Amino acid sequence: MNGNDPDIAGFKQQLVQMTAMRESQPPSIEIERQMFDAQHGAVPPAEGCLIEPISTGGVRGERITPKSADTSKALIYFHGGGHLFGSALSHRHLVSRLAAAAGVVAYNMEYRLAPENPYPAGLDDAEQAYRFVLAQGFKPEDIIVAGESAGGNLAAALLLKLRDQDLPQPAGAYLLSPWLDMSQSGASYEARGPHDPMITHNALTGCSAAYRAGASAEDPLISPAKADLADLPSLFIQVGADEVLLSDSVEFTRRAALAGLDVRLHVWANMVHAWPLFHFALPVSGLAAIDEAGAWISRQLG
Amino acid sequence: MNGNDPDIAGFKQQLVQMTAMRESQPPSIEIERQMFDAQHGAVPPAEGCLIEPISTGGVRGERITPKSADTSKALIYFHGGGHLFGSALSHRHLVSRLAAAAGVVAYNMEYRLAPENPYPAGLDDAEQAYRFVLAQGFKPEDIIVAGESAGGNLAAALLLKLRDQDLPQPAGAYLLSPWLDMSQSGASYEARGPHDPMITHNALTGCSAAYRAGASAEDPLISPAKADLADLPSLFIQVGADEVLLSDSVEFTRRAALAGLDVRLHVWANMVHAWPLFHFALPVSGLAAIDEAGAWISRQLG
Amino acid sequence: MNGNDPDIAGFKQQLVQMTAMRESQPPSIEIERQMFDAQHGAVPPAEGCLIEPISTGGVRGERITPKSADTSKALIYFHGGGHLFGSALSHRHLVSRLAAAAGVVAYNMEYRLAPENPYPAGLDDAEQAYRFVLAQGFKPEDIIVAGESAGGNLAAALLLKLRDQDLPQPAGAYLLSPWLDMSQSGASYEARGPHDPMITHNALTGCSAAYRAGASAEDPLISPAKADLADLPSLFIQVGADEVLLSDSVEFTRRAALAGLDVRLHVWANMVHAWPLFHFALPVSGLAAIDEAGAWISRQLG
Amino acid sequence: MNGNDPDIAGFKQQLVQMTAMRESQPPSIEIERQMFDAQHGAVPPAEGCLIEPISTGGVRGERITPKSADTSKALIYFHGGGHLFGSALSHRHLVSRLAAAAGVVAYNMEYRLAPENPYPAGLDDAEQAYRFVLAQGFKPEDIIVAGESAGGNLAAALLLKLRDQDLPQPAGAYLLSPWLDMSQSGASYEARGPHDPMITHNALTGCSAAYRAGASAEDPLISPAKADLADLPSLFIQVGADEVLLSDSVEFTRRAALAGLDVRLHVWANMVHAWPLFHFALPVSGLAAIDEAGAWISRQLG
C-alpha cells in the first residue's frame, strides 16, 4: 500500500530459506521441472485471453490472444529456467499478463532444454519459433521478442542470430533479468550477491556448464553481453537492483547504447530476479512491472 | 479484438433466453438471491487485494484493500439487484476490480432488501454505511460514493440525504446504469426496450412496488431523477445505449447540469445493463469500462 | 493551481462588462469580424505544426500538420462565431492545439457567413469541405468532424446532410458548446442564464434570424437537436455548466443515446461558453479541455 | 510525423557547420554568454506559467509556477553550459515546459560560472539554491533535483554534498545528458564521437580545465561518475545515443544500480546532446522527451 511493496520483505525471507535448502541439497532436474510446472501452471492466466496450443514441424507453444488485443501485433516470449526447466505452461500466467497489458497477441514458445539438448538446440528452436511467427503473416516490425533470465539469453541471442543470417530484426526486444554472460562476470556478483536471495554464482555456474556442454562461454551467441550489438533493434530491459545478474543488464545496455541503439533500462530498487514472474507473491511490484513492460511493448508496436 | 467486442452478440442472446424464461416463470426471491450469490460469488476477485468482513452497529460489508492502493482514499459501493437481491459477496468481483483500477480502498457495503425491508430501510443502511466510513477517519473529499442500478439508486439518494442533513458531500459519485426513476418513465423504455435483453419495464414495475411498499414513486428520495440536484458533488455516469434505464441516466445528467454540477456521462454503444458487472462474460467492454470508471475515481480523489 | 482555475473568476467579470457594452451598443458585423480576427489571429499556434493554406474550387482553409501527428488521420474543424464571424485565421490557435493534442492532421475550414450568405450557404460549404478531405485520400473512418457553437451547428448538420444523401459517416464528431437549436429553447436559458456571462438569449435570437433569413428554425438541418439522430457516428460533446446553450448539448446527447449511439457528454462546472477557445485567458480549464478533446479524437481514430 | 523526427537530420547538419566554425575560431566567453542568452531567451516559455525572479542571500533565479501545477511540489533545475555559460533566462523555455508537463513548481536557479568562479563556487550556489527551496517550506520528498550537461554535473554533485553533510536526499534526480566525468573518459568519445555533431572531446577538455582551475578530475564532487552512490535517491537519466557524453550516463547508471538505487536510463536513438533543450528545432523528439521527463518527475513527487 501507499507506494511500498508489503510483500517483498516476506518473499525475500522465503527465498533465503529456499536457496539455503537448494544449496545444501542439489535436486533432480526432471523433478524440479515438474514442481516448477506444478506451481506456475496453477497460477491463473490473465483474464479474457484465448489460448491455442501450437504443434507443427517441431515448433511448439501457445498463441495467447487477449480479446482486446490487436491481432496483427505479436510478442514472442521465451520462458527462463536456466535452460534447465520452465515451459509455455509455467510462464503462461506471466506471458498472458504481458500480452493483455500490451494489447498484442503472445507467442508463448517452447524450446529444447539442457542437459538433454545443450547449445545450440534451444537457439535453433528460438529461430524456428521466430520463422513460424513471420510465417503467420506478422511482419518483423509487428514483433517484439522477449524472455526472462535464460529466455532473455535466447531472445538476445536470436537477435544476434538474425544479424549473422543477414535477416531483418523484429521491432524490439523486451529483456527481464536477462542472463547474458554465461561466464558469470560483473561487479554485481560481489556487490549485489549479499542482496540477491534467489540467484547464486554457484547456480549459474552449473546452469552454464550444462547448457554449453564444453562450448565456450566467450561465444557471443552463448554470452550476448560479449557481442557487438551494431544494428540490433530497440531494447527495453527490466532488472532488479538486488540481483547478481544486474551487471549483465547494465553491460548489455552499455553495448546497445554504444552501438547507437534506442535502449531503455529500468533497475527497480529492492527487486529480486525476474520479480514479474513472481507477481502471484509480489502483486504490487510484479503487476506494476508487467504494466511498465506492457506499455513499452504497446508503444513499440505502433 | 481490434476495437470490437467478440462476446456481446453471444451474451445478448443468452440474456434473451434468460429473460424469456424468467418472464414465463417468475421465480422465488429467496431462490434468486442464492443463485445470484452462487454465480457471482464464484467470479475470482481482482488479483492482489485484501478483503476484511465488516459487521458492527448494523453496518455490514467488506473492506477491500488493493495492495497498491492509497489507504487514505475510499470508494463506497452499493451493489444493485433491484433492491431485491445482490450482496457484498456477489459484487466483490466488480468492486475489487474497480478498487484495484482506481488505486483506492473499497467499502463494499450491504443494505437491507425488499420485500422484507421496504423503503427507507436500505437508505438508512446506506447513510449508516457512509457514517461508518467517515468514522474510519476518511474525510468527505476522500470518498467517492457509487453503485449500479438499485445501488445507483441508493448512492444518488444518499447524496440527497446528506444535503437534507446539511452535511458535506463526498468528492463525487460514480453511477453505473443507475435506476433513478422508480415510476419507469422515459423515452428509453420504448426507444431502447427492443434492444434491452436484460431489463424489462414489467420487472422494474415489480421491483418498484416491492421497494416502495405503498410509498410514492414521485418522492425524490425514492426517485432521484425527480430531485433538484443543487450542491451535489461531481458525477460520473456510465450507462449502456441498449438499456430501458438509459433515460434515467440522461435525466439525472440534465438535472446535474442544470444545477451547475460537473457531470460526465458516457453512453456506451451496444452495451447492456450494468455490463461491467458482467466482465466475466464481457472482458472487452466490461474491463474497459471498469478501467474508465477506475480512472475517474482515481482522478477524482487525486 | 492545485485543481482550481485561478483565472475563471476574473475572466467571468471581464465577460460581464463586455456583454453589458455589446448589449447597450450592437456593433458592425464587418467591424466585429476584424476585431475577432485581430484578437484571435494574434494568439500563437500550437508549437511544432506546419500550416498550409487551401484554396481550390471555392473550398478554403488550412491544413494543420503537427509534426508528431499521424498524417493518415484527419480532424475537420469548423470555427464558430454565430454564423456571423470567425475564420480559419481566428481559430488556428485552438484547432492547432486540438490537432497536436490528438496527434492528427487538422483541416481548419472556412465557410460562407450570414448576413451575406444565409442558410444553406455555410452547410453546402461544410459538405464540400468534407468531400475535399475524402478526396485527399482520407477514408470516412479516418475523420472526426468538429466545431464549437455555430461550427458545432455545422458539424452536427453535416452529419444529418450525409445521412440524407445516403453517404458514409465520419468516425465521430467532437462538439464544443454546440448551438443545435436555433429557436433558443431549453431549461438552461432560464436556469443557466444568470450564470452565463457571455451568451444571451437576445444574441442567439439575432444570430439565428440572420442565418435563417426566414428559413424555419424547426428544420432539423438548421436545428440538429430537432433531428432524429439514427445512424450518426460516435459523439463527444464538451459544454460548460454556466451556459444558456447547455440544454442543446444535453438534448442532442439524449437523442444520440436514444438512437443507440456511443455518446460522451462532459459538462464542466464553472465553465463559460467555448472556454477552450479562450485558453489564452483560461490556461488551466482551457488547455485541460483541449487535452480531454485531443485524447477522445485520438482514441476515436484508432 | 508518423513516428519519425523530420527535423533531426537538418538540425544535425546545422550543428556540424556550427561546430566546424567554433573549432576553427574559438570565440569569447563573454560573447558566447550573450549570444546564448539571446537565442534561448527568445524562445517562448511554456504557455500558462507565472514567473517570479529571485535575488536574495546570493541565491538567484526564477520561480516558475504552471497555473495547473501543485504548488507544494518543486523541481530544482540547474542549466548546463559547460560551467561557462547559460542562465535562468536561457533555460526558462525548457524548465517551464518541464514544469508544465510535470504539474509542479520549478526553481530555475543560477549559479556562478567559470573561469571567473571555478569549482567549488557553482556547487556552493547549488547547495544554497537547495537550502533556499527547503526554506520555502518544501520538504525533501517534495523536491526533484535536475539539470542538463554541466547542470547535471551540479545536480548529481549536490546529492553527494547532501550525503556528506548527512542530510535528507530529495525525492529523486532527473539528469539530461549529464557531464559526470570531467576527465573525458569513456568508450563513447570514440564510439559516438563521429555521430556527435555538437559536443567534442576538445571542447569538454577546455571546459573542464576552466572549471577545475587545477582541481583534480578524479575528485568525485567534480566527477560524480567517480563516486560511490550509496544512499542517493531515485534517478531518471535521459541521454542521446549520438553523444560523446553517453558513457558518463551509462557509468552513473551502473554505479547507481550497484549501490542498489532505483534507476531509469533512456538512451534515445539518433538524439544529439540535451536534445530537449533544442525542442524549438526538434519539436518531435524534444517535446516527447520533455513529456517523458515531466511524467517521471510527476510520478516521483506523486
Numbering used by the authors:
A (entry chain A), B (entry chain B), C (entry chain A), D (entry chain B): 1 to 302
What does the paper say about this structure?
The protein was obtained from the metagenomic DNA library constructed from the permafrost-derived microcosm. The PMGL3 esterase demonstrated low thermal stability with rapid inactivation upon incubation at 40 °C, which is typical for the cold-active enzymes. The PMGL3 demonstrated a typical fold for the bHSL family with however a unique tetrameric architecture.
The CAP domain (residues 1–42) contains two α-helices (α1 and α2), while the large catalytic domain contains 8 β-strands (parallel β1 and β3-β8 as well as antiparallel to them β2) surrounded by 9 alpha-helices (α3-α11). Two PMGL3 subunits within an asymmetric unit form a homodimer, which is consistent with the current and previous SEC data. Further contact analysis revealed two possible tetrameric forms (T1 and T2) of PMGL3 within a crystal. This indicates that T1 form is more stable and presumably the one found in solution, while T2 form is a result of crystal packing.
